[PDB]
Amino acid sequence: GAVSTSPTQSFMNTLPRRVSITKQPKALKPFSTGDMNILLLENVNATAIKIFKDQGYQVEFHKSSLPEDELIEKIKDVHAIGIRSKTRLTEKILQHARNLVCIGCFCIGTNQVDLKYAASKGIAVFNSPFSNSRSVAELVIGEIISLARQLGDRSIELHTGTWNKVAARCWEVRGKTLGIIGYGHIGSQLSVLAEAMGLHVLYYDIVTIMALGTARQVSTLDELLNKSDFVTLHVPATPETEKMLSAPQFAAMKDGAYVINASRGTVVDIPSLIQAVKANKIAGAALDVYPHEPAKNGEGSFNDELNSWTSELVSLPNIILTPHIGGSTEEAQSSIGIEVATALSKYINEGNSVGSVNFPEVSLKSLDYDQENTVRVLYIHRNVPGVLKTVNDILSDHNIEKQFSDSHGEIAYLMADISSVNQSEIKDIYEKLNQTSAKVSIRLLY
Amino acid sequence: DSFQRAMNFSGSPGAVSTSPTQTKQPKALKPFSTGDMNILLLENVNATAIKIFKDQGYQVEFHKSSLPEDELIEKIKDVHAIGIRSKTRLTEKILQHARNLVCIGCFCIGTNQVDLKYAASKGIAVFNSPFSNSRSVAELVIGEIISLARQLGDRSIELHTGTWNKVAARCWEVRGKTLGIIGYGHIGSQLSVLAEAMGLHVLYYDIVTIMALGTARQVSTLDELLNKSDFVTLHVPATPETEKMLSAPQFAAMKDGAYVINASRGTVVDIPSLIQAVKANKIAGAALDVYPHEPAKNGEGSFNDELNSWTSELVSLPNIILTPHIGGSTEEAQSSIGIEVATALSKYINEGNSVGSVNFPEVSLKSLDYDQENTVRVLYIHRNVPGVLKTVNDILSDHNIEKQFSDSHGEIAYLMADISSVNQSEIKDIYEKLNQTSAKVSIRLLY
Amino acid sequence: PGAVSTSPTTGDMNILLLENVNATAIKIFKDQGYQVEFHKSSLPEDELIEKIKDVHAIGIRSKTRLTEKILQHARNLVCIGCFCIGTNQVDLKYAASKGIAVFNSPFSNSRSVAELVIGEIISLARQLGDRSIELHTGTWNKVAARCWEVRGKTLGIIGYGHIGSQLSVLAEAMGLHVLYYDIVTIMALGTARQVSTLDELLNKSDFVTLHVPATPETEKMLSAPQFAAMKDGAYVINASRGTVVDIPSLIQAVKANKIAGAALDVYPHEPAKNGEGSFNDELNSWTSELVSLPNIILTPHIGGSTEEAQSSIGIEVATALSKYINEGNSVGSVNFPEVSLKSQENTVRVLYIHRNVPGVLKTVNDILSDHNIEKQFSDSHGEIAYLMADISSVNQSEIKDIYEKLNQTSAKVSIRLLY
Amino acid sequence: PGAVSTSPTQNTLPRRVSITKQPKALKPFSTGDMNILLLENVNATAIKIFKDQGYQVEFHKSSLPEDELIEKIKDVHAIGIRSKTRLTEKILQHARNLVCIGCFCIGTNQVDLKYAASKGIAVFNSPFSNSRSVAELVIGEIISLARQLGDRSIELHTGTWNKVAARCWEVRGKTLGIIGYGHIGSQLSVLAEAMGLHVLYYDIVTIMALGTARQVSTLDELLNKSDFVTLHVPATPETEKMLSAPQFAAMKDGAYVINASRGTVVDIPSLIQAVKANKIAGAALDVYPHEPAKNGEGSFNDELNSWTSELVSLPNIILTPHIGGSTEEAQSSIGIEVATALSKYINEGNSVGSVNFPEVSLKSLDYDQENTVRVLYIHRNVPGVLKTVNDILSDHNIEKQFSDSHGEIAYLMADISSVNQSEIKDIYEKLNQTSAKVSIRLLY
Ligand SMILES: NC(=O)c1ccc[n+]([C@@H]2O[C@H](COP(=O)([O-])OP(=O)(O)OC[C@H]3O[C@@H](n4cnc5c(N)ncnc54)[C@H](O)[C@@H]3O)[C@@H](O)[C@H]2O)c1
Ligand SMILES: NC(=O)c1ccc[n+]([C@@H]2O[C@H](COP(=O)([O-])OP(=O)(O)OC[C@H]3O[C@@H](n4cnc5c(N)ncnc54)[C@H](O)[C@@H]3O)[C@@H](O)[C@H]2O)c1
Ligand SMILES: NC(=O)c1ccc[n+]([C@@H]2O[C@H](COP(=O)([O-])OP(=O)(O)OC[C@H]3O[C@@H](n4cnc5c(N)ncnc54)[C@H](O)[C@@H]3O)[C@@H](O)[C@H]2O)c1
Ligand SMILES: NC(=O)c1ccc[n+]([C@@H]2O[C@H](COP(=O)([O-])OP(=O)(O)OC[C@H]3O[C@@H](n4cnc5c(N)ncnc54)[C@H](O)[C@@H]3O)[C@@H](O)[C@H]2O)c1
Ligand SMILES: O=C(O)CC[C@@H](O)C(=O)O
């Protein structure tokens, strides 16, 4: 009835990637310490080895994990350690790590590390949560097509001599609808690929999320299950996602629809999927993840003793099974290398703990090249009253340009930039802070 | 002199200048011959075709496979149109018995299963569907690119037999990789756009200069494409030049750990040389939809050393995807073929329209309006000799001819004429006169 | 879809060009080797008569009247090019009666009009015209009130034809939502939506624009009741036809602050020529009223007045006349049957224009019966018909014989043989 | 002869709603109600955001005489202005309660930023809210100039019918040269491509193109190859008169010039001369070297800019009075940006995006952090102040703390737990009598 102001809101005025004309960051070196020793285990990617050697750190590399007694001896001298999933950094092991500044988990998982014990010794732990997104999104595009045309079945037939040309119930993916459960890093990336392959994209999330492209958020999962040809899961493991696709969800789906799970091994009830496929309700499925997975690669590893429905699952048509290869590419392993090595490096060189999984997240803008006589104090301490009183007293002869402290449990982390400090005064500040009683670990960068 | 004002002509001062630019209802018609229309459909044509024919009111007989030769002969005696696919062989042996047949539908690309020349000689028009499977093949390839990049087939076969084998080594994200398309035709150009959207660089080789879609680039030699591509895929016709165009020297021109995809034609790759390139770790994987020798029917021991001798060798190799000519085996493709060919046969029967025919002159005329009473359409198939239009236009000379179109194709020609103000007495007279001209091959009148 | 299911899917030829047709046309004709005479305006009737007695093709635009009085003297004329949409300046029936084919350019101005509208949308949304007129007379008047970003607003297109569908894609790219009303079901481009009633479009649109023909149904189709159906402070654009809007009712809707602005390219009465006192109360009585209103953009029928449009007309019509002369192709002709044939030695093409009566193909195909006819196409248009036949193995002696025989048939209107 | 190998690897989320813990809402100590004063007809979106916080809001459509402004500002905690209200030291000296200033506009020169910072007063503005509005204006002027729309309409409004297709063009296929590929330039780029123009841009920085725009290394390459040239640059000494006689000579015959950036960036006498010589076919100007302070009837004339009578007598010139950002949507977005900024500064102490202040903020306290106070301590960047402050707070655990400096001023923000109402008053009075203190608030 009246022309009127459109819904416009200022955060939608964006700017493309450009080159700053910044001032050179001052490079900072620790007090009293010599060479940084990095130990990398479990065949971390060469991108990581390179980033560390270019800093001038000494790097020791291993393709697998170490026996516990060998790991103990090596870890005594080491300043940073990179691991993946199979190295268990327990208190038994970390108690001997007198020099360790940080731990890199070159992977998503961090449970192999006793995070709380580590924090208690002032050891920051970093990981790579989102480095595998593109690899999983592409896997799914490939499985959509592969399921749509029963590729796996065709190839297995031909490899054993059966020629079975079938158009019945095989589809062009253009025009079909993809239902994405969880519009996160993977879900939103998959959305754009799926639209490019000519699918209509619906998504269900527990949060209101701005769509990419022409994807549509649906308010209930049953709308998504009702209207989707392909349903795919990109959710975390929570109690709410635990078995969130079970018999009633498969009944809500279309006859001859398809199910894809490269999220978490718990999110699908497999006995109910097996039964939905056997009833010809579900036309095919692709699983990358299972309730129980072997610890190592091997030849009889995937069987009825690991998951009891294995012999049933294997005997079904149009089932694609993969052994957790969602993120298993050279590009992903290489990006993890860069993300985590860069993270450890910024923590060592600048004290930046943003993205740490067990630590307060603290950082400060870099000092300029030309800020002569400025020191950065990195003070990890016990989260009790009276500690900033102590510290800011010790530093009170010098102007503090800026300072940031934050806490995480029983631990806290102060970072302060102080100006006009000569080398005599630096040694004095170090020894004073080193004999405070709240101190867990201290480092000064100059 | 006037050659400076000619190099500063196709160059310019600098001037703003013009950019480089660039209802009535159809009357439905029925033949003069009594007894309707029998359609025979073989080899499991799609339901879209069955529906189009029944809605015309034709009597339709449907079969899911082909017939023995003796059964096919007896059925074809009464039939007015026959739909087939690749495995029904309409030889002269069979078509000699087809006294009523007006047209043949090939619900597929190939027409070699039909003796097209014998058919044309009897005034039988043949129709097919060349370009209906394009999207289906392009999507197959996108899926095999990813599947090969990630060794999906190998992973699944392992797990189905109980082997857990997680591998990132030489498994890749296809974003950033380069796709080399050999043959930038209907399928190649479609695949190009998909591949860019999946974040591949696309190069293509063709024997002709073709305008790129998107930001694909044409390379002048195949070896440049083989040198620069991570994935190589073939979308070419079967010519003597494409016969074994990827052999040992082309695999040596390719990258270490590159990939080969062939959903074009069974002859275009030399398989013993591919087997050898894979065994030497030169080629990291391959997907084949088509083979030199393919079984005639689906079956359990059909794909073996007796059909192609290197079968047992090929199957024992890692990261090999084998499919049984399923490039165009989708519901959407089979359904579009259904509609294209059944619409074509239907317009040929109801209106005489032979456009898109593979063995016939291509002739058609605008539909007559609903309300054009007393108008007949003459469909006269004859021998392409002088003096035939003289004869025909004489026979019709008492009636105004609203329009007429004749065209020739070899020894056969096809006249189509719309004549107004014709009563039923005069119609029978025209029919019997045209039916006893000596140039006549077959005649039909629609009113 | 409650189950996964299938998805949807030659230097003898004299050309005379009048009224300043575009150079693209002059070039196409000279590259054929035709002799070309060009004029920037039209000719007096007596001069036109003398020139036309030898002309084989004539190009005109809107102001040259090819009456029977003039065409009766055109002994050589094969065809007429209208380098424009309109053809009423030509007596089409008399022309057809002499075997003269007439061609025009209906759809060459589509992009030019669609861009004009995108510009007027923005200009009206921000009162640009008013701002500039103010400043040109010294008034500084910065105004944000009721001025809008077009992003998010809705465009209502009446008539989703060549112009409407082109405008649709532009408007979406500028971030408008597009609704359209047409009297026919038309598949949308992009994410435009067809609305089943005009009143729904008027109710839901911020900008309303007209791209319809002049029919009795479009005659004054936007009047007082349609402006009442529109939003307060909505906008009206008419670059279709001068009759389609009731202007006194638009004036009244603007005066009542119902309509916030309007752009008109077309009027009920327009001057014949450019001039200084041409647009006034004697031409349309509401002129002084219309002019005194805020946020009204007035243009003098410039919707298709670009270099690119004039240039495309040049190419379309000159190519058409050229294919008619060189190949007999009459497809796109406005007053003639539409006939053409796919374009070695010893083949002739017979072009026989004749009276549409029985017995004529009998006569003609008799005359040609010593020679094989490879193909042949005849069609009719009223009292006239047009045969085109390709005959093989013909030497120049036999060609002259066929010509003289066809030239003395009684149904004949005009004949030409191409070899 | 090649080897397949790792691609060159370079993950966001789309905007989403948080399902965190409910933010604890915080109220200042010694203060009662927050009074907001809004001048110069700020948009209703701002009035609404402030009343929903429960602030008392006084609104005016214009600016105030200096003596009235002085009296009102004595009580006021936040003031919103636009370009014409001059907040000098003369006026701000009497601002005993003022916590912050909103500039509901891009410009902040009307405010004495340094004096303000010296009294602990944070100033906020809206730099980039007008981008889309300017980009659309330009698309409209491109078309309007290409078709001489303005000239046609002026003619008809006076009774002249003048149909012209000569040197009138479809913009499809033409080239747009964007000088300054910033917020406006990059937005315009995408629009222009959609209207079928080829886009070149010149910038002093390497900027990744949107779409199929192409960065050119020199300005004269852009001037040489463009049909339409448009300016979206800041006022620097390098942009001062950056289009003058030599740049117009580098441009195409019958090309077009658009300036909705800054009033100084084009040399107008040289543009007038290029148009008169038929070098430049048309121009649109939104901005001038001298502009009137207010709307009025004889404001734009030879006394303001001497070439006015010359400029106005030329064909195909579009003149607008600084309306690049004058839309409902732009004014409304400014409303939201600045009112939200002032509100977060008042309610949470967040000074990020401040133009004259250290940029400090802390994650919100949870609903269930009972007995926590937030200390907002604006002081002098001199040694020994954190010693004093962290001493005063040393009976309480500090959960977190962030101090940063900007010249002679610094700003500490500290979250302290387990504080009852007795102890809160004690901390306030101690911090209020520290010698480094400029201003202090506590939120609890
Ligand atoms: N298969 C593999 O090898 C592999 C590799 C990488 C990641 N992953 C897994 O994939 C999943 C997604 O990774 P990501 O980075 O995209 O996650 P993300 O955290 O970026 O996003 C997950 C999404 O799930 C949504 N969500 C949470 N609970 C939900 C619920 N109950 N219903 C619906 N939506 C819900 C969240 O709102 C969010 O949008 C995780 O489980 C991750 O560990 C697996
Ligand atoms: N696998 C299947 O089920 C299936 C399905 C459909 C089509 N096909 C086949 O795919 C192929 C492509 O079909 P299309 O529709 O895209 O064909 P098309 O005719 O449109 O394109 C083929 C292209 O190959 C080019 N070409 C020919 N010889 C070449 C050579 N020696 N080197 C490089 N380029 C060459 C041609 O110039 C042309 O541009 C054909 O063999 C067709 O039969 C297979
Ligand atoms: N101003 C100019 O200089 C200029 C230039 C070119 C064309 N035009 C005119 O613009 C108009 C549109 O031209 P076009 O090329 O798009 O024509 P078109 O014939 O392609 O489009 C007309 C459309 O309007 C629809 N329509 C007809 N009557 C209708 C009605 N009563 N209500 C709603 N829809 C109706 C038709 O079905 C069709 O889709 C015509 O009048 C044409 O002559 C003007
Ligand atoms: N007319 C109005 O009402 C109005 C409205 C909004 C903005 N503006 C003005 O428009 C301009 C653009 O605003 P914005 O938000 O895009 O600015 P921005 O700061 O995002 O972009 C300016 C761009 O200019 C580039 N640059 C700087 N100096 C340059 C030079 N000498 N030559 C070329 N490029 C140069 C910068 O690198 C940057 O990319 C500013 O002057 C702004 O004040 C005017
Ligand atoms: O081209 C002309 O002569 C102007 C009028 C023209 O628009 C027409 O009648 O189509």
UniProtKB/Swiss-Prot annotation, chain D:
<dbReference type="GO" id="GO:0061759">
    <property type="term" value="F:alpha-ketoglutarate reductase activity"/>
</dbReference>
<keyword id="KW-0597">Phosphoprotein</keyword>
<keyword id="KW-0028">Amino-acid biosynthesis</keyword>
<comment type="similarity">
    <text>Belongs to the D-isomer specific 2-hydroxyacid dehydrogenase family.</text>
</comment>
<dbReference type="GO" id="GO:0005737">
    <property type="term" value="C:cytoplasm"/>
</dbReference>
<feature type="active site">
    <location>
        <position position="291"/>
    </location>
</feature>
<feature type="binding site">
    <location>
        <begin position="183"/>
        <end position="184"/>
    </location>
    <ligand>
        <name>NAD(+)</name>
    </ligand>
</feature>
<keyword id="KW-0007">Acetylation</keyword>
<feature type="domain" description="ACT">
    <location>
        <begin position="374"/>
        <end position="444"/>
    </location>
</feature>
<comment type="pathway">
    <text>Amino-acid biosynthesis; L-serine biosynthesis; L-serine from 3-phospho-D-glycerate: step 1/3.</text>
</comment>
<dbReference type="Pfam" id="PF02826">
    <property type="entry name" value="2-Hacid_dh_C"/>
</dbReference>
<keyword id="KW-0718">Serine biosynthesis</keyword>
<feature type="active site">
    <location>
        <position position="262"/>
    </location>
</feature>
<feature type="binding site">
    <location>
        <begin position="322"/>
        <end position="325"/>
    </location>
    <ligand>
        <name>NAD(+)</name>
    </ligand>
</feature>
<feature type="active site" description="Proton donor">
    <location>
        <position position="322"/>
    </location>
</feature>
<dbReference type="InterPro" id="IPR029752">
    <property type="entry name" value="D-isomer_DH_CS1"/>
</dbReference>
<protein>
    <recommendedName>
        <fullName>D-3-phosphoglycerate dehydrogenase 2</fullName>
        <ecNumber>1.1.1.95</ecNumber>
        <ecNumber>1.1.1.399</ecNumber>
    </recommendedName>
</protein>
<dbReference type="InterPro" id="IPR050857">
    <property type="entry name" value="D-2-hydroxyacid_DH"/>
</dbReference>
<dbReference type="GO" id="GO:0006564">
    <property type="term" value="P:L-serine biosynthetic process"/>
</dbReference>
<dbReference type="Pfam" id="PF00389">
    <property type="entry name" value="2-Hacid_dh"/>
</dbReference>
<dbReference type="InterPro" id="IPR002912">
    <property type="entry name" value="ACT_dom"/>
</dbReference>
<feature type="modified residue" description="Phosphoserine">
    <location>
        <position position="7"/>
    </location>
</feature>
<feature type="binding site">
    <location>
        <begin position="260"/>
        <end position="262"/>
    </location>
    <ligand>
        <name>NAD(+)</name>
    </ligand>
</feature>
<dbReference type="GO" id="GO:0051287">
    <property type="term" value="F:NAD binding"/>
</dbReference>
<dbReference type="GO" id="GO:0042802">
    <property type="term" value="F:identical protein binding"/>
</dbReference>
<dbReference type="InterPro" id="IPR029753">
    <property type="entry name" value="D-isomer_DH_CS"/>
</dbReference>
<feature type="binding site">
    <location>
        <position position="203"/>
    </location>
    <ligand>
        <name>NAD(+)</name>
    </ligand>
</feature>
<dbReference type="InterPro" id="IPR036291">
    <property type="entry name" value="NAD(P)-bd_dom_sf"/>
</dbReference>
<keyword id="KW-0560">Oxidoreductase</keyword>
<dbReference type="InterPro" id="IPR006140">
    <property type="entry name" value="D-isomer_DH_NAD-bd"/>
</dbReference>
<dbReference type="GO" id="GO:0004617">
    <property type="term" value="F:phosphoglycerate dehydrogenase activity"/>
</dbReference>
<feature type="binding site">
    <location>
        <position position="286"/>
    </location>
    <ligand>
        <name>NAD(+)</name>
    </ligand>
</feature>
<comment type="function">
    <text>Catalyzes the reversible oxidation of 3-phospho-D-glycerate to 3-phosphonooxypyruvate, the first step of the phosphorylated L-serine biosynthesis pathway. Also catalyzes the reversible oxidation of 2-hydroxyglutarate to 2-oxoglutarate.</text>
</comment>
<dbReference type="InterPro" id="IPR045865">
    <property type="entry name" value="ACT-like_dom_sf"/>
</dbReference>
<keyword id="KW-0520">NAD</keyword>
<dbReference type="InterPro" id="IPR006139">
    <property type="entry name" value="D-isomer_2_OHA_DH_cat_dom"/>
</dbReference>
